[PDB]
Amino acid sequence: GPVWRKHYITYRINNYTPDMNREDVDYAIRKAFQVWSNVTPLKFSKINTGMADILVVFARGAHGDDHAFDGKGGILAHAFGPGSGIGGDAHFDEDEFWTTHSGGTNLFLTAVHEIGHSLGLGHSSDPKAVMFPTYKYVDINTFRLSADDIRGIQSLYG
Ligand SMILES: O=C(CNS(=O)(=O)c1ccc(-c2ccccc2)cc1)NO
Ligand SMILES: [Ca+2]
Ligand SMILES: [Ca+2]
Ligand SMILES: [Ca+2]
Ligand SMILES: [Zn+2]
Ligand SMILES: [Zn+2]
Secondary structure (H helix, E strand, C coil): CCCCCCCEEEEEECCCCCCCCHHHHHHHHHHHHHHHHCCCCCEEEECCCCCCCEEEEEECCCCCCCCCCCCCCCCCEEECCCCCCCCCCEEEECCCCEECCCCCEEHHHHHHHHHHHHCCCCCCCCCCCCCCCCCCCCCHHHCCCCHHHHHHHHCCCC
């Protein structure tokens, strides 16, 4: 599949969920990017205006792509693989309740998974992998990619 063909990648937060403090959204997303820059040559920078490679959006129901959200539960988020335009973008279902902790749906953990897709990863069959497509809270303060995730991303970058 597609990959980014450059090392400096930008992201922009289109809008903020009212579920969380603004600074906590910023930090969760920053930390999620750091998970992947830790194990690749990629460098991520937040921009506040203009066209970013990865646009982060909170939206509910039908929201202008061909892929609608479904209210609370079920689909939590989705993201597009590397490419122009909508490529790379990561969308989070506002009908979920996003948090910094084990309550609701943890934004950081979900963003790690989605950014994996934004960088070109698909799903893993390994339940230990962050790319395993079932959300499960794990302690975010000690979170680590599985060997499978590191294998996956290092097949695309580095
Ligand atoms: O795969 C999907 C669509 N399905 S999902 O949104 O139910 C979903 C979303 C995120 C996750 C997830 C997996 C591991 C950690 C955090 C979230 C699981 C299911 N989007 O990427
Ligand atoms: Ca949903
Ligand atoms: Ca994009
Ligand atoms: Ca919400
Ligand atoms: Zn979408
Ligand atoms: Zn997924």
